[PDB]
Each structure stands twice: as C-alpha cells, then as structure tokens.
Design a protein around this motif. Structure first.
Motif, PDB file in Angstrom:
ATOM      1  N   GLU B   1       0.700  -1.484   0.306  1.00 47.57           N
ATOM      2  CA  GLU B   1      -0.262  -0.293   0.095  1.00 47.57           C
ATOM      3  C   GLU B   1       1.169   0.927  -0.065  1.00 47.57           C
ATOM      4  OE1 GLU B   1      -2.190  -0.628   3.445  1.00 47.57           O
ATOM      5  OE2 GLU B   1      -4.695  -0.691   1.962  1.00 47.57           O
ATOM      6  N   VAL B   2       2.562   1.233   1.275  1.00 48.64           N
ATOM      7  CA  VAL B   2       3.039   2.862   1.468  1.00 48.64           C
ATOM      8  C   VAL B   2       3.603   2.730  -0.280  1.00 48.64           C
ATOM      9  CG1 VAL B   2       4.978   3.359   2.710  1.00 48.64           C
ATOM     10  CG2 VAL B   2       2.770   2.425   3.484  1.00 48.64           C
ATOM     11  N   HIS B   3       4.249   1.220  -0.628  1.00 50.16           N
ATOM     12  CA  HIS B   3       4.846   1.600  -1.716  1.00 50.16           C
ATOM     13  C   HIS B   3       4.292   1.787  -3.046  1.00 50.16           C
ATOM     14  CE1 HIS B   3       9.167   2.418  -0.561  1.00 50.16           C
ATOM     15  NE2 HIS B   3       8.701   0.888   0.759  1.00 50.16           N
ATOM     16  N   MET B   4       3.085   1.335  -3.850  1.00 50.18           N
ATOM     17  CA  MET B   4       2.056   1.726  -4.869  1.00 50.18           C
ATOM     18  C   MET B   4       1.909   3.107  -4.306  1.00 50.18           C
ATOM     19  SD  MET B   4       2.268  -1.264  -6.010  1.00 50.18           S
ATOM     20  CE  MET B   4       1.187  -0.962  -7.218  1.00 50.18           C
ATOM     21  N   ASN B   9      -3.700   4.886  -9.561  1.00 47.92           N
ATOM     22  CA  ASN B   9      -4.752   3.712 -10.422  1.00 47.92           C
ATOM     23  C   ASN B   9      -4.586   2.217 -10.150  1.00 47.92           C
ATOM     24  OD1 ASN B   9      -5.711   6.210 -11.355  1.00 47.92           O
ATOM     25  ND2 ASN B   9      -3.398   6.536 -12.714  1.00 47.92           N
ATOM     26  N   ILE B  10      -3.850   1.578  -9.674  1.00 50.88           N
ATOM     27  CA  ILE B  10      -3.003   0.897  -9.079  1.00 50.88           C
ATOM     28  C   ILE B  10      -3.535   0.306  -7.999  1.00 50.88           C
ATOM     29  CG2 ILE B  10      -1.002  -1.463  -9.533  1.00 50.88           C
ATOM     30  CD1 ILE B  10      -0.912   0.679 -11.767  1.00 50.88           C
TER      31      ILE B  10
END
Lengths: 150, 67, 211, 83
Positions: B1-4, B9-10
């Motif tokens: 969640e953090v690195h996304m 949009n992902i």
RNA sequence: GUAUGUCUAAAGUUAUGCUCUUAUUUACUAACAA
C-alpha cells in the motif's frame, strides 16, 4: 622402501594421476612442478611455472589432461599434462591454500582462499574471467576442500 | 500500500483465497535458478508455455494451480 | 502432554529425589521438583519430610513406647503432628500404629538419563561457555601454528601476531621481565653462578632452536 | 605434631641420608667468596631432585587409589569421611 | 530483538562386537512460519 630425490627445497605436494594413473606429479617447495612415472626408470618432464612463489596444492582433472596448481602470490594456474601451455590465473586477492576441479566435468573448477571466499571457474567461464558463484559461509581460511565423488 | 503510493491507479486486491505459491519455488528449474543467482537480478519465465499455445490462459492456470 | 501433577512414588523416582536432595539440599524444592517430570515441588518436599528422609525411623515401638503413644493420645487428642514430635517419629506412621493398637519404563529411563546428566553437570552457563571458548581458542591457536609452521617449511618466516592488546598499559611478558623484583643484594659473591646460569640459558635457547 | 617438631624430625632424617655416604672476603666489596667443592654441590642437586621426585611419585601413587559426582567432590567427601 | 564480545580490513627486517540401511521418540534450540 625405495627412494627418489625430487625437490631439494622442503615442502612437497605429491599426487598420483587418477584411477588409471601411471604418473607421479609432485610440485615441491622449490617453485617447480615436476613429473615422474611408476616405472622404476624415473623420467623427468618439468612443468615450469612462471609465478615466483612455491607451488602448494596440485590436483588433476577427471580427464587426466589438465592439472590445477596453487601458489602463495595469489596465483592459480591450470596445467596441461604433457605440453603445459594452457589457461592461467595470475591475479587473486592473496593465496588460495587449496583448489579442486570437478570429478565429472573438468570444466568446473573450485579455488578456495585465505579470505574465506570460494570461487568457481568453468571452461567458458575461465575464458570469461568470471565465477558461476562464490561461497561465503566459512569465515576463517579454508585450506581444505574435496568433492563428493559424483 | 505504501510503495504503491507512487501511482494511485494500481488497485490492490487482498485475496481471501490462499493460493499455493510457497511450493511454487520448489519447482526444479526455479529452485535451480534461485540457487544460481549471484547478484541483484531478475530472470523472468513463462510459467506455462505450451499450455497457452494449446488452450486459453485460464485452463493453463487451473493445471498450474493443481500442480 | 502438559497436565496437573500428582500420582504415586515409583521407587526409581524416589531414588532420583534422594539424589537431588543430596545434591541441592533440603531447601530448594523447586529444582528437585523440576528434576522429576511427574511430581511437584510441594509433593517432593512432603515426601522427603515424611517418608524419604533417613533421620526418621520406621522401627516398631517398644511396650514402653506404645504406652507413651497411647498415653499421648489419651492426653493430646488427635494432634498427631505434636504427638509425632513427642514420639520423635513421623506422624502418619504413628497414627497407623495407633490405629493398629486400638483394634512406562521408557519414560522412567528418559527422566533417569536426564537426571544423571543434570547431577553430573554442575556449572552455570558462564562456566560452560568459558570452557567452550577455551577449547575453541586452543583449536584456533593450533591452526595458526600449522599455518606458521607450514610457511616455515615453505621458507617464509612469519612472526606470530601479538594478542590485540585490550588497553594502553597491557603487558606482554616476553618483551621484558614482568616486574623484576631483584634478589636481595649479595653478601656471598654470585658472579660465577650468574655466568653459569647465563650459559645454561643460552644453551637452552640454542637447544630449542635446534629442536 | 607441630611444624617445630616435624622440621627437626625431617632434619634428623636427611642427616641419615647424609650419613649413608675455605672463606675469602673482599671487605671493600663485601663479597664473601666461599670457594667450596663443586662435586658436593652437584651431589646436593641430584639428591634434592631425587628427594622431590620421590615425593612427587608418592602422591601420584596415592592419587591412583580410586557418593560423589566429579573428581573434586569425591575428594571433598573423602575430606568429610576422614573426620 | 538486543545489550555485549570476538573477527576482518595488505604489503614482505638483510641467518646458513562393528559397518550399514532406515523409521520413531524425547530434549534443547531457533527474531524461521503459525
């Protein structure tokens, strides 16, 4: 029982050829690798080295065509049996105390160092000046290695 | 969640259904490649090749899932 | 399986407890309990107090002793611990006498092996660790020697590295004399002796070199 | 037996071990060179070593004679049992 | 997971009854998973 004066300088590293092995390879402390036979008529074919320091750990391939060699000046050298003109490894960190090649394929080739990092060198990978992969789970100088024979 | 958070949009999908992919790495060649690895590298593969050629992807995936 | 302690005193168990008592003494009942996988601390201590302790007695009472007992019963009504003390016996036994008058192995072997192992292992972890380090150190030293010796054989003389000195005033004792407190000044002359001993020393060094 | 007696009695013994078989002073230096027989000092050295050796082997025998756990305890129980 | 403690970090000091094959326990350990 019966003798032979080989290497006037102290230390030696005597080893036969593999299984069907008529030969007596030596490589002493006098920085010179030498070749004598099992037939009492002891015939000398001296594989001269190039590197300055004495030669330490000498072992053959399964083929009996090229034998590895380790010295104190960070120098491993492969050596073809009769000719002796062959691939060479002048450069390492410091001495590899012990070295061995694969008993099923002469290509793969392990060298073991004082810094405790062990090194592969296949035939094409000896041409590359690379390693298939190192080992680093010993921390002291290893000075000792041999393959499970398969 | 953090690195996304780099790209919003992902969408993320927490699977309720646990799929066996611990045992995925115990496939022969995969494990082999893993052992082989000398450095920070990726070595992609087609987890099923011939199956795609024969049938749609879903069919292939079912087989894979079973395996 | 974990569970609530109790049961019955198997003879082997009793023996083990006795051994423990010899080892750890009569006031560390936890440890002794731990040694027995089945039985509790309290249980153990009670057992020791009641049955197992050798400074009790289970010999029969003389007629005089019987009289003393029953008289005590008559006078101290069923305060049997007090009565026991008076008798100088353990209480249960006394009570029994009074009453009379009025009218698997694998597991056991496991705990045994463990027990004997423990009792023959009487050092805190600091000790064990220390000896481990000592032997390891020794091994390291010999390996180092083998290298050094190997190199000497090879023709390269390598002086053995000093111990990486822990502090500024850390001492190497081979450098120079430890704290040469000299002998008391000579009344009788000592010169020849000094010479002879010096020669002996030097000779010894020579021998060592040759050795 | 006190260390008074045991000294004199051991003194008496080593006198029986004897019974088996010049001074020059430089007063400016204070050095009192007692030149004496070098053969006798050697005979002292060998005898004294032999006496200590005899004692050393005596313990070794008594150590190899035999309710404990380790080497020390066995002896510690022996220290209790002697009383 | 830590305190803490070791380790490495490159330049050459001038000498001539057993072996075997396995399956099971129990214990301990495990910043590995549940």
């Amino acid at each position: 029982i019966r003798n032979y004066p080989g290497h006037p300088e102290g230390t030696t590293a005597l080893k036969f050829l593999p299984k069907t092995g008529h030969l007596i390879l030596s490589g002493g402390n006098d920085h010179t690798i030498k070749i004598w036979d099992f037939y009492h008529d002891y015939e000398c074919l001296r594989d001269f080295q190039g590197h300055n320091k004495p030669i330490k750990a000498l072992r053959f391939t399964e083929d009996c065509q090229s034998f590895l060699s380790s010295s104190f000046d960070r120098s491993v050298k492969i050596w073809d049996t009769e000719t002796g003109k062959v691939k060479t490894r002048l450069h390492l960190n410091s001495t590899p105390a012990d070295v061995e090649s694969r008993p099923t394929n002469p290509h793969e080739f392990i060298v073991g160092l004082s810094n405790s990092k062990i090194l592969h060198y296949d035939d094409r990978v000896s041409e590359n000046q690379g390693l298939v992969q190192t080992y680093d789970h010993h921390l002291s100088s290893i000075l000792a290695l041999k393959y499970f024979p398969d | 969640e953090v690195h996304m958070l780099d790209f919003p949009n992902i969408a993320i999908r927490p699977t309720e259904l646990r799929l066996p992919f611990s045992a995925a790495m115990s496939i022969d060649k995969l494990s082999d490649v893993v052992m082989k690895a000398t450095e920070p590298q990726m070595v992609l593969f087609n987890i099923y090749d011939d199956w795609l050629d024969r049938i749609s992807s879903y069919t292939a995936f079912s087989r894979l899932t079973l395996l | 399986p974990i569970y609530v302690k109790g049961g019955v005193w198997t003879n082997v168990e009793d023996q083990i407890l006795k051994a423990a008592v010899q080892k750890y003494g009569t006031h560390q009942w936890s440890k002794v309990a731990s040694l027995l996988q089945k039985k509790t601390a309290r249980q153990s201590e009670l057992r020791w107090n009641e049955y197992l302790n050798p400074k009790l007695n289970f010999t029969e009472f003389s007629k005089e002793e019987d009289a003393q007992l029953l008289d005590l019963a008559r006078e101290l009504p069923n305060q049997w611990r007090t009565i026991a003390d008076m008798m100088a016996r353990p209480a249960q036994v006394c009570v029994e006498r009074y009453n009379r008058l009025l009218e698997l192995e694998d597991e056991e072997k496991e705990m045994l092996a463990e027990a004997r192992a423990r009792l023959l292992n009487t050092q805190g972890k600091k000790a064990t660790r220390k000896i481990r380090e000592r032997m390891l150190e020794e091994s390291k030293r010999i390996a180092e020697l083998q290298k050094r010796r190997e190199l000497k054989q090879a023709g390269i003389n390598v002086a053995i590295k000093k111990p990486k000195k822990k502090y500024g005033t850390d001492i190497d004792y081979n450098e120079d004399i430890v704290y040469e407190q000299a002998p008391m000044p000579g009344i009788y002359d000592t010169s020849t002796e000094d010479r002879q001993i010096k020669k002996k020393f030097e000779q010894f060094e020579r021998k060592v070199n040759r050795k | 037996i006190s260390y008074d007696q045991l000294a004199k009695l051991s003194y008496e013994k080593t006198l029986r071990n004897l019974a088996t078989q010049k001074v020059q002073k430089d007063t400016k230096t204070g050095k009192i060179t007692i030149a004496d027989d070098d053969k006798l000092v050697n005979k002292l050295a060998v005898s004294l070593q032999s006496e200590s050796k005899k004692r050393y082997e005596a313990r070794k025998r008594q150590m190899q004679n035999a309710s404990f756990i380790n080497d020390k305890n066995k002896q510690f129980n022996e220290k209790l049992s002697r009383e």
